[PDB]
Amino acid sequence: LTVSARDAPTKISTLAVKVHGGSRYATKDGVAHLLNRFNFQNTNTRSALKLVRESELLGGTFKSTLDREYITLKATFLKDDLPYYVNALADVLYKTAFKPHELTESVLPAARYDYAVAEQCPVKSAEDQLYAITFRKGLGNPLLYDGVERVSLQDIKDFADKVYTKENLEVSGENVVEADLKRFVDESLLSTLPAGKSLVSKSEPKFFLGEENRVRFIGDSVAAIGIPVNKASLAQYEVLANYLTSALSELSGLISSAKLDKFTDGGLFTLFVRDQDSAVVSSNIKKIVADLKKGKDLSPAINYTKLKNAVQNESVSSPIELNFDAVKDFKLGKFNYVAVGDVSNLPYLDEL
Amino acid sequence: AYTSHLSSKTGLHFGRLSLRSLTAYAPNLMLWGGASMLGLFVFTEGWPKFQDTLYKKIPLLGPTLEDHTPPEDKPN
Numbered sequence: 001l002t003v004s005a006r007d008a009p010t011k012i013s014t015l016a017v018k019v020h021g022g023s024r025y026a027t028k029d030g031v032a033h034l035l036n037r038f039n040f041q042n043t044n045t046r047s048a049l050k051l052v053r054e055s056e057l058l059g060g061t062f063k064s065t066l067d068r069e070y071i072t073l074k075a076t077f078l079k080d081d082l083p084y085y086v087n088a089l090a091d092v093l094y095k096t097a098f099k100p101h102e103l104t105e106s107v108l109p110a111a112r113y114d115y116a117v118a119e120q121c122p123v124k125s126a127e128d129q130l131y132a133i134t135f136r137k138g139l140g141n142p143l144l145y146d147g148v149e150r151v152s153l154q155d156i157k158d159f160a161d162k163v164y165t166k167e168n169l170e171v172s173g174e175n176v177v178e179a180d181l182k183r184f185v186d187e188s189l190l191s192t193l194p195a196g197k198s199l200v201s202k203s204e205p206k207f208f209l210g211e212e213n214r215v216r217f218i219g220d221s222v223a224a225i226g227i228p229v230n231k232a233s234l235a236q237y238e239v240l241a242n243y244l245t246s247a248l249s250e251l252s253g254l255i256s257s258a259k260l261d262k263f264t265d266g267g268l269f270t271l272f273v274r275d276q277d278s279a280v281v282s283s284n285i286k287k288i289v290a291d292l293k294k295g296k297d298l299s300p301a302i303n304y305t306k307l308k309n310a311v312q313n314e315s316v317s318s319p320i321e322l323n324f325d326a327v328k329d330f331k332l333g334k335f336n337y338v339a340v341g342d343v344s345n346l347p348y349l350d351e352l
Numbered sequence: 353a354y355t356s357h358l359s360s361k362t363g364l365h366f367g368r369l370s371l372r373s374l375t376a377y378a379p380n381l382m383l384w385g386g387a388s389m390l391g392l393f394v395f396t397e398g399w400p401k402f403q404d405t406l407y408k409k410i411p412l413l414g415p416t417l418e419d420h421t422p423p424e425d426k427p428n
Contacts, residue, residue, distance in 0.1 A: 054358050083356035180354075 001166050001190070004317070005173035005181045013082060014174040015075045015181075016317075017089055020199045021163030022069040023143045030145025031159050033114070036071060037107045038156060039064040044095040051088065060085060068131075068139055069263060071163070079175060083184050090189040093164045098157050115144045122222045122340045123257070123272055125215060129338045130226035130270060133211040139263070165196030172317050204230060204265055209334040214343045221278045221341025223285040229260065229267040235322040236298075237269045240330055242308050243301035244271070251291060254284040262320050278345040289352045292332040299328060 026032040040062050041048050055061070060077030073092060075085040118124045132140040145151065171190075173181050185191070207228040229237050237260050243249055244258045256274040260267050273284045302324050313319040339346040364371040396402045408414045 057358060057360075058355070080353070081355055083354050084358075087356075 002170040003185050005176040005178035008175040010175045013079045016172045017073040019071045019169045021071040023141050024068050024139050029149035031151050033145040036066040037110045041102050042097040043091045086184040094189040111145050126222045126224040126338045126340045129213045138205045166193045167198050211336045212349045213338050215340045217341050221281045223273045224338045226336045227269040236327050239298045239305045239327045242305040278342040295331040
């Protein structure tokens with residue numbers, strides 16, 4: 001039960017509760033996605049309709065977001081309604097109703113919409129396979145629910161009993177007095193939660209190199225590569241991503257996107273090439289791979305990547321501390337590869 | 353001061369109808385009453401019972417409804 005806050009003379013406040021209950025801890029496929037879409041339904045003391053109508057007259061909103069590591073409950077409100085929104089979030093983690101007709105009428109139709117939206121994007125598909133072939137059963141779990149594995153109402157109740165524990169969540173706030181937040185976090189239903197255990201494992205996950213996968217798709221062709229990164233080489237791949245999508249590189253015109261997703265135990269580097277014509281996708285990916293094998297000098301991009309990292313970290317409260325002062329060179333070694341689209345006209349791994 | 357709850361009441365109502373909606377519509381429902389009396393006078397102008405008690409007492413438009421035929425010109 002960690003509580004921290006930052007103060008400021010402003011009008012709006014923000015409260016967040018982060019739970020180590022993302023897709024990488026799911027016991028069944030998509031069970032974490034389903035728990036995300038049940039977070040602000042009826043509780044045992046207040047209805048979903050009553051909460052929406054009451055907070056509108058006070059000036060606040062609610063949201064819940066899912067990724068591969070976290071489930072986040074967030075509230076944005078006016079600075080003087082702090083105690084009201086502490087208890088609203090405490091009741092969600094404590095006494096959610098979990099009714100059989102809420103899943104059939106509200107939760108399942110909402111999950112189908114999310115899955116159908118992400119399925120229409122070939123870049124989201126290629127990123128999912130890159131996570132699947134690099135890490136198989138850890139970070140490689142599917143993010144969204146698609147019905148391939150059956151998940152029942154008791155499964156969602158069981159999953160919530162495991163991740164909603166006092167040792168597995170942190171409380172953060174922006175433009176909030178920290179002494180007042182600590183008082184309200186106590187004398188609340190958060191202090192009466194079960195004291196389970198932290199699900200975080202410190203050891204580096206198992207990864208696999210040299211894999212490949214192909215998916216047929218109607219639309220835009222996409223070629224992507226992925227590289228697992230350890231904890232001591234996160235800064236080197238942070239500079240490379242910014243350099244490859246900046247005016248300092250000649251390959252930035254051939255690259256659609258490039259990023260480094262950071263975890264507390266490592267990361268994954270992703271690079272995507274997307275075009276409507278499969279002849280351009282095949283030609284661009286070959287030039288990028290050959291050029292990266294020769295080697296690149298990343299020293300000119302160190303100052304640029306220091307400012308870009310500051311932009312992203314302003315919103316975040318617990319970013320990874322990086323140095324960037326010792327990044328000198330880079331040479332591509334082994335990587336994974338995924339091709340999505342008109343695969344019959346896209347290259348294989350042995351041809352790159 | 354910190355606010356931790358909302359204080360509210362419930363307005364008087366019966367179904368789709370409420371006291372506040374009645375109050376807003378009340379001044380306009382009297383004008384519709386006066387527009388129906390005016391429309392009733394138009395269609396009962398030829399009725400001689402209404403002429404003798406209401407319409408013939410209008411200052412300028414009243415006397416023009418009175419008939420001025422001498423008795424020697426009427427068979428009944």
